[PDB]
Design a protein around this ligand. Structure first.
Ligand SMILES: [NH3+]NC(=O)c1cccc(-c2nn[nH]n2)c1
Ligand SMILES: [Cl-]
Ligand code: NA
Ligand code: NI
Ligand SMILES: [Zn+2]
Length: 330
């Protein structure tokens, strides 16, 4: 059995191995990468996403979000307060201001300690889920806007055409910008590229142990759990590595740097934070191995989670018994 301890694996594909995306995902899984929930892929030296990042300043962040915490340093929720629009250039200047800039620190571990000690006392601002892409159209390898669609995957595996599209999103982060514990919609894969800037630290729970995390979350956020049987779907709960370790929850951590890809695997819970101003791009995707995870994915039907149009078909076809109840929550 490959990677029995569910360690996060790091891959260094050659330029030849970088041609066929699906093939490489399958190769990583043949090595047990998925057991960890998250893998890092370092592109070959011959590859680049686009020529420069010199001309990105005019991109608009239509609704920046201020992430306001409640709770305690290691166990907190965050809610997203909407702010007035601003450009990426304006956001970059804000991230670098004395109020929001990354503090002096010795190494990634010192910064990690400062994050978990101090995050709740600040409210960082970020740009999230901005449809768009920064890959140049001439980048033919691992271009996140040119991947096979989930709708086509389902059609290929199960035989029926469905409506819906699948396009990338941009994220602009600053110090302490936080992504709460979650799996992807319908327990899809994700792929995540860090285009520019400071690092992003990730925490992940092996898929085989996701229920352990759920059980702990239920204990630590008891009101939220009563409100929804899949409340981690809401993407607002944080639990620190110290608290995870105290509670015996299996997990791993890794820092992604600019120029690196991260893949999350079906039912791999993840959370993390940004070290300073950065830009990432991400998209969900599927493979044949996802289908069984999609069939079995929990769903939030309390109303809070969101309205993702593309998800409808996925629930409708894979989860017919649940569909009407889920559709009401939409
Ligand atoms: N699955 N991918 C993610 O959860 C992900 C991808 C890119 C950026 C972020 C993110 N970075 N800061 N807040 N959220 C999350
Ligand atoms: Cl700090
Ligand atoms: Na470990
Ligand atoms: Ni995610
Ligand atoms: Zn819910």
């Amino acid at each position: 059995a490959q990677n029995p301890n569910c360690n996060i694996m790091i891959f260094h594909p050659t330029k030849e191995e970088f041609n066929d995306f699906d093939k490489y995902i399958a190769y990583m899984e043949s090595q047990g990468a998925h057991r960890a929930g998250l893998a890092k892929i370092i592109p070959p030296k011959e590859w680049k996403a686009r020529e420069t990042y010199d001309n990105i300043s005019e991109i608009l962040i239509a609704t920046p979000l201020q992430q306001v915490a409640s709770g305690r340093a290691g166990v907190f929720t965050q809610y997203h307060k909407k702010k007035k629009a601003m450009t990426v250039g304006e956001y970059r200047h804000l991230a670098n201001s004395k109020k929001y800039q990354t503090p002096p620190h010795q190494n990634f571990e010192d910064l990690e300690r400062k994050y978990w000690k101090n995050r709740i006392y600040n409210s960082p601002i970020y740009g999230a889920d901005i449809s768009g892409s920064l890959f140049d159209e001439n980048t033919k390898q691992w271009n996140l806007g040119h991947l096979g669609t989930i709708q086509d995957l389902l059609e290929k595996e199960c035989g029926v055409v469905i409506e819906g599209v699948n396009t990338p999103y941009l994220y602009f982060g600053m110090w302490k910008t936080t992504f709460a514990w979650h799996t992807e919609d319908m327990d899809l894969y994700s792929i995540n590229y860090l285009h520019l800037g400071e690092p992003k630290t990730w925490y992940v729970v092996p898929p085989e142990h996701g229920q352990r995390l759920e059980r702990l979350a239920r204990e630590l956020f008891p009101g939220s759990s009563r409100g929804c049987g899949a409340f981690l779907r809401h993407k607002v709960a944080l639990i620190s590595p110290t608290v995870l370790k105290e509670n015996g929850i299996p997990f791993n951590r890794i820092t992604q740097e600019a120029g690196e890809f991260m893949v999350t695997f079906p039912y791999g819970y993840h959370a993390g934070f940004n070290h300073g101003f950065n830009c990432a791009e991400a998209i969900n995707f599927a493979t044949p191995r996802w289908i069984d995870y999609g069939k079995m994915a929990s769903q939030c039907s309390c109303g809070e989670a969101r309205v993702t149009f593309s998800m409808d078909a996925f629930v409708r076809i894979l989860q017919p018994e649940r569909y009407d109840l889920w559709k009401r929550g939409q």
